Structures are given as C-alpha cells and as structure tokens.
Amino acid sequence: AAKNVVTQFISSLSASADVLALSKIEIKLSDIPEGKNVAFKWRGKPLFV
Amino acid sequence: IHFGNLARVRHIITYSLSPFEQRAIPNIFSDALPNVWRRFSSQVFKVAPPFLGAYLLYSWGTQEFERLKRKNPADYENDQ
Amino acid sequence: MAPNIRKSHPLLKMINNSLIDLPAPSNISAWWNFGSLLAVCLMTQILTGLLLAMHYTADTSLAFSSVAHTCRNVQYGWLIRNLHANGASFFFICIFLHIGRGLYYGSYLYKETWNTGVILLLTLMATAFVGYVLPWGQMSFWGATVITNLFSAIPYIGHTLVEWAWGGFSVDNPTLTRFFALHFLLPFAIAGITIIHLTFLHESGSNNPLGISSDSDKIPFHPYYSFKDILGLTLMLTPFLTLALFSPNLLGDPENFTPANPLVTPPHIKPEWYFLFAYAILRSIPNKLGGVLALAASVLILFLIPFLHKSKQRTMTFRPLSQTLFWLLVANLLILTWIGSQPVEHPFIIIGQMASLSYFTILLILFPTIGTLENKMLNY
Amino acid sequence: ALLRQAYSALFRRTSTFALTVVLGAVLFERAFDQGADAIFEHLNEGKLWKHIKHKYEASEE
Amino acid sequence: EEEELVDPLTTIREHCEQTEKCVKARERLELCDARVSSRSHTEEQCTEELFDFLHARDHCVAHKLFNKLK
Amino acid sequence: GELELHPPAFPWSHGGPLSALDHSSVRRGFQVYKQVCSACHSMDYVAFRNLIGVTHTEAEAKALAEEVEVQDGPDENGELFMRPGKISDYFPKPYPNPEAARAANNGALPPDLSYIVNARHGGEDYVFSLLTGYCDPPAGVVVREGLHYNPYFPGQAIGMAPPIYNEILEYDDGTPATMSQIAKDVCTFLRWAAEPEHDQRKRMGLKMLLISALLTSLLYYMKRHKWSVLKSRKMAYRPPK
Amino acid sequence: NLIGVTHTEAEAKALAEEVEVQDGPDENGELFMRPGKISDYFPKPYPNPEAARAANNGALPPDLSYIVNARHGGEDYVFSLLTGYCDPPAGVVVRE
Numbered sequence: 005a006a007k008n009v010v011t012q013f014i015s016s017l018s019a020s021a022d023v024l025a026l027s028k029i030e031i032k033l034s035d036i037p038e039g040k041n042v043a044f045k046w047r048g049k050p051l052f053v
Numbered sequence: 054i055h056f057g058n059l060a061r062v063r064h065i066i067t068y069s070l071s072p073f074e075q076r077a078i079p080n081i082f083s084d085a086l087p088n089v090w091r092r093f094s095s096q097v098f099k100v101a102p103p104f105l106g107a108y109l110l111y112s113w114g115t116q117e118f119e120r121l122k123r124k125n126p127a128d129y130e131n132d133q
Numbered sequence: 134m135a136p137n138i139r140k141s142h143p144l145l146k147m148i149n150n151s152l153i154d155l156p157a158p159s160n161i162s163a164w165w166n167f168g169s170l171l172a173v174c175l176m177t178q179i180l181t182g183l184l185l186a187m188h189y190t191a192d193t194s195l196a197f198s199s200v201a202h203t204c205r206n207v208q209y210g211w212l213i214r215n216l217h218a219n220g221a222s223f224f225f226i227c228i229f230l231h232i233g234r235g236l237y238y239g240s241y242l243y244k245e246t247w248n249t250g251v252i253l254l255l256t257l258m259a260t261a262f263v264g265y266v267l268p269w270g271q272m273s274f275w276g277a278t279v280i281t282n283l284f285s286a287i288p289y290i291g292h293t294l295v296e297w298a299w300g301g302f303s304v305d306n307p308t309l310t311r312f313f314a315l316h317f318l319l320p321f322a323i324a325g326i327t328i329i330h331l332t333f334l335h336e337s338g339s340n341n342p343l344g345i346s347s348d349s350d351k352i353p354f355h356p357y358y359s360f361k362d363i364l365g366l367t368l369m370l371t372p373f374l375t376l377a378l379f380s381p382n383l384l385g386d387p388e389n390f391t392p393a394n395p396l397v398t399p400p401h402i403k404p405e406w407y408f409l410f411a412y413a414i415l416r417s418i419p420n421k422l423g424g425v426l427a428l429a430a431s432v433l434i435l436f437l438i439p440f441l442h443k444s445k446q447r448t449m450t451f452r453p454l455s456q457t458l459f460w461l462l463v464a465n466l467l468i469l470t471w472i473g474s475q476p477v478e479h480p481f482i483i484i485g486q487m488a489s490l491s492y493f494t495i496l497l498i499l500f501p502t503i504g505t506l507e508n509k510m511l512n513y
Numbered sequence: 514a515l516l517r518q519a520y521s522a523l524f525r526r527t528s529t530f531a532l533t534v535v536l537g538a539v540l541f542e543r544a545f546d547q548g549a550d551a552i553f554e555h556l557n558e559g560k561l562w563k564h565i566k567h568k569y570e571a572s573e574e
Numbered sequence: 575e576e577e578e579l580v581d582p583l584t585t586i587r588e589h590c591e592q593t594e595k596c597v598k599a600r601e602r603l604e605l606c607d608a609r610v611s612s613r614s615h616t617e618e619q620c621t622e623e624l625f626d627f628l629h630a631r632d633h634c635v636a637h638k639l640f641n642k643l644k
Numbered sequence: 645g646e647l648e649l650h651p652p653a654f655p656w657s658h659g660g661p662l663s664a665l666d667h668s669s670v671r672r673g674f675q676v677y678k679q680v681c682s683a684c685h686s687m688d689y690v691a692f693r694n695l696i697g698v699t700h701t702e703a704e705a706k707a708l709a710e711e712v713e714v715q716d717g718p719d720e721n722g723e724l725f726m727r728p729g730k731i732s733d734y735f736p737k738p739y740p741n742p743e744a745a746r747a748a749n750n751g752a753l754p755p756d757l758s759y760i761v762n763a764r765h766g767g768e769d770y771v772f773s774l775l776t777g778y779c780d781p782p783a784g785v786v787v788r789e790g791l792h793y794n795p796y797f798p799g800q801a802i803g804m805a806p807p808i809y810n811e812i813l814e815y816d817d818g819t820p821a822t823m824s825q826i827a828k829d830v831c832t833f834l835r836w837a838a839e840p841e842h843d844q845r846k847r848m849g850l851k852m853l854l855i856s857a858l859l860t861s862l863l864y865y866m867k868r869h870k871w872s873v874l875k876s877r878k879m880a881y882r883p884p885k
Numbered sequence: 886n887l888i889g890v891t892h893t894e895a896e897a898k899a900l901a902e903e904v905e906v907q908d909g910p911d912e913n914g915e916l917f918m919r920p921g922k923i924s925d926y927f928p929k930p931y932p933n934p935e936a937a938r939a940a941n942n943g944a945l946p947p948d949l950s951y952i953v954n955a956r957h958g959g960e961d962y963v964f965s966l967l968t969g970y971c972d973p974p975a976g977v978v979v980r981e
C-alpha cells in the first residue's frame with residue numbers, strides 16, 4: 005500500500021502529459037534540400053537541422 | 054508522569070494470561086454473538102423510534118410535495 | 134540522567150508522554166477512535182492539498198481550467214483531487230461523530246478541551262468554505278456570493294465588511310486570490326490549535342463510557358490504543374475509498390462542472406452535505422439578519438452545552454430519558470439536513486421551521502430539564 | 514511443521530523478520546498485480562484497447 | 575421489401591406500448607388531448623399525462639433496447 | 645409549470661463498478677462527435693493525443709489532427725498564420741466566442757461537451773434520452789418559433805434541432821448506423837471525455853478492495869490478540885475481612 | 886494616473902479621448918473601436934515584439950514603465966544616452 009501511494013504522489017511532481025507531449029519532435033529529412041538550413045521550434049528554443 | 058499517582062487501591066487481585074496462551078477470538082457462538090444480540094436488543098427501542106419517526110416525516114413530505122405537482126381535474130370542468 | 138532515553142530526551146519524552154506511556158482508560162469504546170482519525174485526516178488533507186496547490190492557478194481566467202488540467206494531465210492528479218475533496222467529507226463525518234460522542238458521554242465537562250474543540254470546528258468550516266471556491270465552478274461562485282452577502286445584513290459595519298472581504302463590488306478575482314491564501318493558511322492554524330486541544334485534554338486524561346474515575350484501571354496507550362486506533366482507521370478508510378473510487382461524483386453538485394457565470398443564477402443553490410443542516414436553519418427565519426443570527430447560534434450554541442448540564446451523572450449511559458432525547462436530536466439533524474437540500478416550498482418550509490425550533494428547544498430547554506427530572510427519580 | 518520452521522527462521526530475530534517483510538512485499542506485489550489485472554481484464558473481454566488493437570495495428574490501409 | 579434498415583428503438587418502442595402500464599397511460603393521454611383540443615378557453619395541458627406515458631414506455635424500452643445494439 | 649420528466653436507467657456496458665468502457669463504442673462515438681456534434685459543440689479539454697492507445701492508433705491520431713488547420717503565430721513580421729494540426733493540438737472550436745456561437749444558433753449557445761455527462765443530472769442517461777426523445781408537444785403547449793419540443797429538456801423547448809437520424813453517417817467498422825445506435829455510441833464517448841481515468845480508476849478500486857479486505861482482517865486479529873490479555877482477565881476482592 | 890499628479894481630471898479625460906481603443910466582443914461577437922476612457926492604459930505602438938522589431942530594423946524598443954530602475958544609472962543613464970550621440974572614434978565601425 006505505502007509503496008504505491010508514495011509512488012503515485014511522487015509521480016504527481018514529474019512532467020505532466022501536456023509537457024511530455026512537446027518532449028520530442030520528429031522532423032522529415034525528405035523535405036530539406038541541400039545546403040539550405042531549416043529551423044524548427046523544439047522545447048521553446050530553436051532547433052537547427 | 055501519570056502512572057503511580059493515580060489512585061489509592063487495596064486488596065484487589067487480577068489474573069491474566071500471555072496472549073500466546075489464549076485464543077484471539079474465543080467463544081464466538083457460546084458468548085460473543087449472544088451478547089451482540091443482548092446489546093442490540095437493549096438499545097433498539099431507544100434509537101430506532103426517532104429514526105423511524107423521521108423516515109415517516111420524510112416519506113410524507115416527499116410525497117405530499119409531489120402530489121402538489123399533479124393537477125386537480127376540478128379546475129377544468131367549467132371549460133367547455 | 135534517566136535510564137531509558139524515552140523519558141529524558143526533550144523530544145522523545147514528548148512522543149512518549151502522549152502516545153506511548155500515556156495512561157488511558159481501559160474501557161474507552163470505538164467512539165474514542167475519532168480523535169486520532171481527525172488528526173490523521175488533517176495530515177492527509179494537508180498533504181493532498183499541497184500536491185494540488187502545486188498545479189493550481191488562483192485567477193478567474195485559469196482556476197477552472199488549472200484544476201481540469203490537474204485531473205487530465207498531472208500524473209495521478211485525478212486521484213489526488215478525488216482524495217482531497219472526499220477527504221473533506223470524511224473529515225466532517227469524523228468530526229460530527231467526535232462531537233456526538235462528546236455530547237452523549239459528557240466530555241464537554243472538560244471545558245477547555247471542549248471550547249478549543251468548537252474553535253477547531255469553526256476553523257474547519259471556514260477552511261472548507263474557501264476551499265470550495267477554488268475550482269471556480271457555478272456553485273463555487275454562487276455559494277461564495279450568497280453566503281458572503283449575508284454580512285451586509287449586519288448593521289452599518291455590514292455593507293462595508295462585505296466589500297472589504299470581497300476586495301471589490303462583487304465576488305471577483307481579488308476575492309479568489311485571497312481565498313486561496315486563506316485556504317492554504319487555515320489548515321496550519323487547525324494543526325496549531327489541535328496541539329492546544331490535546332494539551333488541555335492531557336491535563337485530565339480521557340473520559341470513558343461509564344463516566345466514573347478510571348484511575349483504578351488505566352492502561353498504556355501503546356499497544357492497546359495504537360492498535361485499536363489503527364484498526365479504526367482501516368475500518369473507516371474502506372468505505373471512504375470505496376465511495377471515492379467507485380462513485381467519485383456521488384456527493385458533488387454537477388452545477389460545479391460548469392465554469393462560474395455571474396449572469397446565470399443556478400436554480401438550486403445548496404452547499405455540500407455537511408453544511409445542509411445549517412443552511413436549513415438559515416432559511417428557516419425569513420429576514421436576512423435574523424436568519425444570519427440563527428445560523429450563527431446553530432454552531433455557537435456548542436459553547437453553551439457545558440453550562441446546561443444538570444445531571445449528577447456524567448454520561449447518558451445510565452439515563453434512559455436523556456438517551457432518547459439525544460437520539461431525537463440526532464434524528465432532528467437528519468431532518469434539517471434533508472430540508473437543507475429541498476427547495477423553499479411547502480411542506481418543506483414549515484417542516485424546516487419546526488426542525489429548527491425543535492433543535493434549539495432540545496438543547497436549551499429539554500436537556501437541562503430532563504436532567505433535573507432524572508436526578509429526582511434517583512432520589513437526589 | 515512450517516509454523517515452527519517459519520518462527521525459527523523468519524519471525525525469531527527482528528533482523529530476519531524485517532528481511533522477510535521486504536522479500537514478502539516484493540513477491541506479493543508482483544503476484545497481486547498480475548492477478549489483479551488478469552481479473553480486471555478478463556472481466557472486460559474485448560472492450561479494452563489491448564483487445565481491439567489488432568484491427569488497426571498494422572492490419573489496415 | 576427484402577432487406578431494409580430499421581431502428582431497433584422504434585420496434586421495441588412499439589412492442590412496449592402494448593404494456594398494460596402504457597396502454598392505461600396512453601389512454602388517459604388521448605382523453606386529455608381530446609378534451610383540451612376541443613376547447614377555445616382552457617389552461618389545461620396534457621404534459622403530466624404525456625409524462626406518465628413516456629415514463630412507462632421509456633422505462634420498458636431501457637430494459638430491452640441495448641440488447642439489440644453494438 | 646414545475647413538471648419535469650426523468651430519464652430511465654440504461655444498462656451501459658461501463659455501469660458495473662468493475663466494468664470498463666467499451667473502447668469500440670468509444671471509437672465510434674468519436675466519429676459521431678467529429679462528424680456531427682463538433683459542428684456546433686466545442687470540446688476544449690480533449691486533444692488528439694488523448695485518442696492514442698485508447699481508441700486510435702498513433703498513426704491514425706496524427707492523421708485526424710492533420711485534417712485540421714490551426715492558427716499559430718506570431719511569425720517574423722508579427723503575423724498570425726495557419727498550419728496543419730499536430731497531435732498536441734486540442735479539438736477545434738466551432739466559433740471564436742459565445743457571442744458568435746449564439747448568432748449561429750438563434751441566440752442559443754451550444755455548451756462545451758468536455759464535461760457534459762457530469763454537468764447534467766442523469767449523465768449519459770439524460771443525454772441519450774434527450775437525443776432520442778424529440779417529439780410533438782402535448783395539447784395546450786406551444787413552442788416558440790426556433791425552439792423544438794423535447795420532454796427531457798427542462799422547460800421542454802430546446803434550442804437544438806434533432807441532431808441525429810438514421811444513417812446520418814456511416815461507421816467505417818460497418819455497424820448499423822441507426823439513430824439509437826449512434827446516440828448510444830456518442831454517449832459512451834462523452835463519458836470517456838469527461839473522465840479518461842474511468843478504467844484505471846476502477847482497476848485501482850479493485851486492488852484497493854482486496855488489499856483493504858486483507859489488511860482490515862489481519863489488523864483485526866492483531867488488535868484482538870493484544871487485547872486478549874484484558875478481555876479474559878479475571879479479578880477478585882480479598883479484604884483481610 | 887495623471888490626475889492630481891500632473892494633470893486635471895478634465896485634462897486627463899481629454900488626453901484619453903484622443904485615442905481609439907479596441908473593445909469587444911459585441912452582439913455578433915465582433916471587436917470594435919471606441920473612444921478612450923481615463924481607465925485605459927497608454928496605447929501600445931505595436932501588436933507584439935515581432936511587429937516592433939520589423940519596424941525598427943530587428944531592434945526592439947523596450948517598454949519604458951520601469952526603464953529607470955531596469956538600467957544601471959537610472960535617469961542619469963537615460964539622460965546621458967539621449968544627449969550623448971556622436972561619431973565613432975578611429976578604428977570603430979558601426980554596422981548599417
């Protein structure tokens with residue numbers, strides 16, 4: 005009983021489902037031409053691919 | 054410190070057995086239950102009465118309230 | 134020095150002199166289990182409250198959604214939310230039995246323990262009141278509006294105290310943010326005063342069902358009552374959890390799943406079950422001020438019980454007349470509760486005024502009277 | 514006579530008693546959870562995603 | 575017809591209206607409706623009667639309808 | 645004029661204390677919502693990602709979200725702009741604000757459906773009874789133009805025209821799209837949207853009960869075992885008499 | 886805020902009417918303009934920083950509400966800067 009309840013409450017403090025939703029970004033390499041650089045927003049800051 | 058200053062007691066002997074020599078829940082049928090009934094019996098007539106008197110009041114007022122929602126056909130007889 | 138470090142240590146001596154070697158009557162029944170439950174409950178409310186407060190936002194434009202976000206997005210946020218709201222109920226169920234027990238077994242003769250008990254009740258009521266506003270649903274807003282509006286019925290100092298309490302002209306954001314602060318605060322005062330409660334109590338020690346000196350038969354709080362109290366906990370906890378996990382919205386008003394709206398008054402504005410009886414007494418007296426006073430007294434009357442004891446015996450264990458009168462009173466309360474949940478219409482209005490009338494009558498007239506009568510029947 | 518054996522090996526020394534409670538919990542968890550989910554799911558045959566999952570899990574379009 | 579789409583609700587609705595409970599309720603409605611429809615001056619309305627019928631019919635429907643739904 | 649008709653109690657597959665939601669019925673309900681209700685009803689608290697692992701595939705969910713245009717911004721010039729949807733987006737709103745909503749429904753305001761089943765006495769029984777309960781007003785009752793008669797709605801004159809009729813849409817799983825079937829599905833879906841934890845909550849309740857029974861038992865023995873010393877105790881008064 | 890500090894109540898109301906403020910929504914859920922009130926705040930030059938930079942060569946003119954406390958120097962710094970524009974010393978080139 006204790007182990008679970010404590011686990012449950014401790015978990016309450018880690019990233020919520022909405023925050024996790026912006027955790028990872030999947031970029032399509034098959035849409036980026038040579039040389040030309042593209043910036044995508046990832047976790048508030050810019051991401052260069 | 055409250056153990057030792059409590060009361061003036063004399064000539065009383067008590068006997069008890071370790072819990073490991075006796076039964077945790079003994080005499081369920083010969084003693085336990087009979088007393089459970091004894092106890093229930095002696096209170097029912099003091100407790101139950103007013104709760105029952107409330108159930109009634111509740112039941113009446115709940116219905117009497119619904120009755121006042123239904124219509125009285127004697128208000129639409131002189132309507133031809 | 135002292136041989137065992139449980140008697141000498143300035144801190145372990147405290148844990149010891151109030152939970153381990155503390156002399157308790159050998160015969161206190163299960164009705165003496167509520168004090169510990171109330172305590173555990175309190176520690177529990179505080180823990181779940183902090184967990185929720187860490188995802189809440191005290192603002193009229195975000196309150197309703199921040200709570201929705203907590204249930205929908207926070208790991209086990211729904212569970213923590215359930216336990217908190219339902220914990221408040223458990224808290225009251227426990228407190229009402231705690232009081233009942235005290236009235237039946239004449240514990241109120243321990244005046245300071247009793248008077249601090251009353252203050253704990255009031256603080257708890259104000260706490261649940263402000264806490265209820267936080268989710269900012271329709272009932273949260275109108276409950277806040279209707280109730281805090283009663284103060285303007287006070288003379289002169291009224292119309293002021295209200296707009297002072299609201300921080301404006303109507304229940305609005307400024308009211309919300311100050312309610313979050315109070316809700317976060319009061320529980321600690323409760324814990325504080327609870328310490329005072331137990332201090333006064335320990336002067337005398339516990340009372341017991343027969344109401345006679347238990348000095349000839351005291352027993353160490355541990356293991357007797359530590360085990361008894363822990364068992365009492367699990368016993369109550371099962372229904373609490375059962376109702377919580379299997380019928381979450383049993384006790385709640387659906388009008389609160391709708392964001393507060395100042396331009397739409399709900400059809401039936403009514404409090405949570407634990408305030409119904411008082412709501413009934415409030416509405417029993419038509420006249421804003423007299424209804425307020427009647428509500429006030431419905432609770433402040435508790436400060437008088439110690440003075441209306443006429444019996445020569447402490448408890449009601451051996452007083453059959455007082456016992457039925459007592460159960461009449463209890464049943465009188467279910468009725469007020471029921472009335473509190475019914476609209477203001479016949480037959481409810483009259484049933485309500487009666488129940489109120491009988492409530493104060495039983496406490497101020499009958500009880501002291503029957504006690505006197507009973508002393509004469511014992512030839513005293 | 515397990516009671517006797519258990520008492521001498523597990524419940525005698527407070528040290529082994531606590532050690533017993535831990536492994537007891539470890540084993541009990543693993544078992545109680547499986548059995549619980551197993552009961553729950555069986556009671557809900559075909560309603561969970563787990564069940565209807567095959568219909569769209571690499572078996573469509 | 576040979577193959578058509580029918581709302582199991584309407585079927586079960588019909589079969590239910592044959593209950594003694596419904597028939598009796600249904601009858602009192604038709605009576606109210608009739609006297610109300612045939613009067614130029616009258617505050618009477620057949621809501622209460624409609625409700626008792628709907629209450630009995632729908633009560634019956636509940637116990638059967640979902641059996642014939644996915 | 646204080647008369648109200650109460651909905652019956654349908655036997656939902658998720659009515660048992662231990663009975664989960666039928667996810668196939670929830671999946672269909674989504675379609676009903678997506679293809680019918682969402683034209684007037686917003687569901688602000690649910691996002692496409694929420695469908696994943698519940699009723700849809702991750703692939704499926706990403707598609708559903710790309711079928712929608714979402715306004716993002718600002719950009720370099722401080723301009724708002726459209727973009728295809730992502731699973732992190734919430735279901736789209738039909739109107740910008742209530743004022744515009746009413747304007748498009750005759751002054752009526754179709755409420756957000758996120759918490760509808762818990763916001764109405766009756767829950768899915770009420771919503772179901774209402775969707776499938778439209779009919780003609782009894783004698784003596786006149787419904788103002790623009791309003792429709794429904795006995796299950798308080799006042800009986802509701803601003804929502806019967807939203808569903810047989811085959812108003814088609815289920816891609818091939819389920820007879822009869823009116824009652826549709827309402828049943830969207831209601832199941834509505835229960836889920838109001839409380840996604842439904843199933844987990846009951847799975848826990850089950851574990852809570854077993855452990856609760858087990859523990860209450862053991863502690864009862866323990867308590868009795870300790871108290872046995874006092875329960876069986878005997879005493880006598882032996883004065884030097 | 887100007888009232889009783891630097892302006893008259895009449896003066897202040899006027900100053901506020903010299904500005905158009907966007908209110909709304911209305912019945913149709915439309916935004917709309919209206920003359921200003923003394924309860925309104927000083928108007929913003931741009932809708933958001935992005936638009937601000939766009940109109941100042943990628944530069945962002947900061948809000949001045951707390952400027953003197955937001956810069957070491959305070960009014961001495963702001964004053965010295967406003968009246969301290971001059972030509973770059975030898976070796977220093979300022980980008981266009």
Ligand code: HEC
Nearest residue numbers: 680681683684749752753754755760771802803804807830
């Ligand atoms: C826009 C043309 C609509 C469509 C399509 C659907 N609904 Fe609706 N709904 C609409 C309006 C304008 C209203 C207002 C009713 C009023 O007079 O207030 C509603 C209301 C509801 C409600 C109940 C409101 C209440 O009980 O107070 C529900 C539960 C509801 N609508 C459900 C619903 C469902 C499930 C639909 C798709 C199957 C649906 N509506 C479509 C307008 C429209």
Ligand code: HEM
Nearest residue numbers: 165167168169171172240241247250251253254327339340
């Ligand atoms: C925060 C809420 C409260 C807590 C934490 C609390 C706690 C306690 C505890 C732990 C006990 C001892 C065990 C017991 O007899 O139950 C106790 C006893 C007592 N409490 Fe409270 N209490 C609370 C509220 C009140 C209230 C509202 C009253 C009455 C108005 C009250 C009256 C008493 C009295 C009179 C006793 C004496 C019991 C006896 O021995 O007869 N308490 N309380």
Ligand code: HEM
Nearest residue numbers: 178179182183185186189218221261264265267268317320
């Ligand atoms: C005596 C203890 C307390 C009582 C009786 C209590 C009671 C309540 C009540 C009745 C509500 C409304 C529940 C609902 O949504 O219906 C509530 C909500 C809340 N309480 Fe408490 N509370 C207590 C302590 C605390 C504490 C200590 C905190 C903060 C550390 C806290 C934080 C909150 C928050 C954040 C909410 C809003 C979210 C929600 O509605 O669930 N509470 N509380």
Ligand SMILES: CO/C=C(/C(=O)OC)c1ccccc1COc1nc2ccc(C)cc2nc1C(F)(F)F
Nearest residue numbers: 258259261262265266276277403404405408411412
């Ligand atoms: C912000 O309002 C919160 C209410 C509530 O039930 O809180 C749990 C609420 C909701 C609807 C209607 C009334 C209330 C609050 O009611 C009360 N709230 C009270 C709070 C403190 C005290 C000492 C007495 C109170 N009495 C009452 C009474 F029910 F009698 F009106």
Ligand SMILES: CCCCCCCCO[C@@H]1O[C@H](CO)[C@@H](O)[C@H](O)[C@H]1O
Nearest residue numbers: 005008009012847848851852855856
């Ligand atoms: C009286 C105390 C009872 C405690 C019961 C603990 C059981 C809760 O167990 C919970 O079950 C969920 C569903 O499988 C899981 O998802 C959670 O991770 C788990 O902690």
